[PDB]
């Protein structure tokens, strides 16, 4: 693996904590210098514009925790609901970044409605995966993925600008997965839950 | 001209100054973390440059989400592990902010070890709460003592196990009275539906 990336992510994290919590004017200035070195290291070794890296890597406030992604797990006739993005042509469970000001089930409901047309409720906590644990490639960011089971209670299948196709798929007919949005192993775990819904919940 | 070497040397020299001159216990710990990382970095890549990773930011947008707090839920014969906090002198489950570089269960095991000296395993996902300027998803993770011993701290003045009717004064930001009640409900009925806000 690339060892340097996880070191630099930890330096930015501590610098971000220092800028939030230090009250010492010379320590605040040391934490700002350290964040700026972290941007410069990322900028040079990924050949990415310095100011772009600052926005993508080093503009959060407060203590730095992993980011939260939500995936909705909706079955019908033992087939799992997937949505295809028009631009990249790849498939994933409905979901996305958790919006500030929304609870996890509100994110699941809103993402399912916007991407698929369906109304959902009857939320179940299924799993929390650590995106980095067996990640294919190195990442600038650390993500926890919360999988929430839901029941379709209304609305109707509807495509959009972003969302070209909405379809259910059986476990021996999976479409081309967006590995960034969901791994094969995360999908296999959801079919294991469908077969035995009283099973232990996966937490990385 | 191998640029990582001068940047790591700068990080080291800043961290050493911070470590020498800070009077705040939390500032000292941050500078100690940075010193520790810089040592680890220098002890690698002897001759070579760092690998260029030109695709690292391809799908990155700088989107901000709720922060993650983790609370470890540790029972011993029907009593729940609490910790008296230096901040307010009130009591809470071991836990805190989830750190970059750690899985949820590594966070739970780490917070329990540093705050109480116990080593835990057998992790179970119990709940995620959020009652909606700071937005927080709080993950309750159950686990069991497999080793270590009870050790109080400069940070953690007392470590006590408490039953449902003898609860100490709770640090309410860290754990509400309803969140603790729910945890006792999981211990008593261990097939209760897991809560997710
Ligand atoms: O919240 C957790 C943090 O470690 C502490 O609040 C910081 O060290 C700031 O003092």
Domains along chain A with CATH numbers: 1-39 (6.10.250.1120), 40-204 (3.90.79.10)
Plot region of B99 (φ>0 → left; ψ -120 to 50 → alpha; else → beta): beta
Resolution of this entry, Å? 2.1
The residue of chain B with its CA nearest to that of A140 is: B56
**Chain A residue with Cα closest to B32:** A14
- Asked if A101's CB is within 8 angstroms of B56's CB, the reply is no
Spatial contact of A80 and A171, defined as CB atoms under 8 Å apart:
yes
Distance B10 CA to ligand 1 centre (A): 25
Q: How many CB pairs under 8 A join A and B?
A: 196
Query: What span, in angstroms and rounded, lies between the C-alpha atoms of B188 and B75?
Result: 11
Which residues, listed in sequence order, are joined to residue B138 by a DSSP beta bridge? B69, B129
State phi, psi for B139 to the nearest 5 degrees: -100, 120
Assess contact for A192 and A106: CB atoms under 8 A. Answer: no
Distance A173 CA to ligand 1 centre (A): 48
Question: Which atom of ligand 1 is least distant from the CA of B24?
Answer: 10
Mutate which of B18, B25, B26 for ligand 1 pocket (most atoms within 8 A of beta carbon): B26
Pairing of strands B67-76, B95-97: antiparallel
First to last CA, chain B: 52
Contact B118, B74 (CB under 8 A): yes
């Amino acid at each position: 693996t690339i060892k340097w990336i996880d070191w630099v992510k930890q330096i930015q994290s501590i610098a971000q904590a220092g800028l939030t919590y230090s009250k010492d004017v010379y320590d605040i200035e040391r934490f700002q210098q350290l964040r700026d070195i972290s941007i410069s290291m990322m900028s040079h070794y990924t050949k990415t514009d310095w100011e772009v890296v600052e926005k993508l890597f080093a503009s959060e406030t407060g203590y730095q925790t992993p980011k939260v992604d939500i995936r909705a797990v909706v079955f019908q006739n033992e087939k799992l609901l997937f949505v295809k993005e028009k631009s990249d042509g790849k498939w994933a469970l409905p979901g996305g970044w958790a919006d500030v000001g929304y609870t996890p089930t509100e994110v699941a409901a809103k993402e399912v409605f916007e991407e698929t047309g369906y109304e959902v409720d009857h939320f179940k906590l299924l799993a929390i995966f650590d995106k980095e644990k067996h990640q294919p490639s190195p990442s600038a960011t650390h993500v926890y993925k919360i999988f929430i089971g839901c029941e379709i209670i209304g609305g109707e299948k509807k495509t959009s600008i972003e969302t070209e196709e909405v379809e259910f798929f059986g476990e021996n007919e999976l479409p081309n997965l967006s590995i960034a949005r969901n791994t094969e192993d995360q999908i296999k775990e959801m079919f294991a839950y469908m077969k035995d819904p009283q099973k232990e919940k996966l937490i990385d």
